Symmetry: C2
Subunit: 54 residues, 2 copies
Amino acid sequence: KRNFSVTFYLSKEEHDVLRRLADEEVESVNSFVKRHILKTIIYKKGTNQDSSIN
Amino acid sequence: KRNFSVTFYLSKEEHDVLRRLADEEVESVNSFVKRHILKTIIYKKGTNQDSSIN
């Protein structure tokens, strides 16, 4: 198996907006950003699905 | 100002789709993802400075 990483930089206030929006539901900014990107691209997709986490 | 960083993982197919969608305009996939998040979260940011040099 393989994985395809993503890594970048942001402003103080931008990262703090992501931190607040994460902490409101899921206090893990990296997991929240991955979820944000996935949901904003597509929702209830048919290409693949899962029922567990790392 | 200081800078704040974000790191996570994607699957082969979703990263390859985002690589194609990036390559259509700005092939730097992590910059394309940064731009996607920024455009979704905010559209009237107060200032947009840069600090690059020769």
